[PDB]
Design a protein around this ligand. Sequence first.
Ligand SMILES: O=C1CC[C@H](N2C(=O)c3ccccc3C2=O)C(=O)N1
Ligand SMILES: [Zn+2]
Length: 108
Amino acid sequence: APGASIFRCRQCGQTISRRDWLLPMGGDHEHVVFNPAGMIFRVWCFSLAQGLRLIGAPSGEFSWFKGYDWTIALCGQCGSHLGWHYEGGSQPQTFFGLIKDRLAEGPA
Ligand SMILES: O=C1CC[C@H](N2C(=O)c3ccccc3C2=O)C(=O)N1
Ligand SMILES: [Zn+2]
């Protein structure tokens, strides 16, 4: 009966990802980053996620991960901004960077 199994949207409980799907980009699944608006994010990288809605066309502008373009990822249920989907790169071609404090971790 594991308690650190899956990640849900902290605002509504939508299933989003799984601890098994953590991805160590540049040798670490956690990346502490800032956007141009000065906001700091503790981003956890996942190979896969579900229950999101990706908004707009990809952009390479200010990407925290070299070679990847990003799209905003909202919770598909409640609209909470949960992170970004990254695409266009290599090994892997795509992944998700999700904001740790916007997810709730718990049992499957
Ligand atoms: O990899 C990324 C993801 C998107 C991101 N980002 C933001 O969080 C943001 C907020 C306001 C205006 C523009 C940005 C954008 O480049 C960011 O800075 N880098
Ligand atoms: Zn939600």
